[PDB]
Design a protein around this ligand. Structure first.
Ligand SMILES: [Zn+2]
Lengths: 26, 26, 26, 26
């Protein structure tokens, strides 16, 4: 479970970058 | 942007499965 | 923790709707 | 769309805190 949560956190972190980039580009 | 949003959606979908699994196991 | 995971899942579910809507509108 | 993306980012940010807290507690 701990390693799985780590993977989910890493995804959420990538989403912050990706969504902030979309915000900038729009 | 559309392909990027698709990738983010796919991640969020995986998170639903993963978090629901953690809920079941806990 | 179980109730907190439930709240996170609910958010992720809302994101799928919101991101799919953005996909449609773009 | 820009305001909606902002709301999603805010949720993802809360998830990082919440998931990191779960990691610490587990
Ligand atoms: Zn998310």
């Amino acid at each position: 479970i701990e390693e799985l949560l780590r993977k989910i956190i890493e995804d959420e972190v990538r989403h912050i970058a990706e969504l902030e980039d979309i915000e900038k580009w729009l």
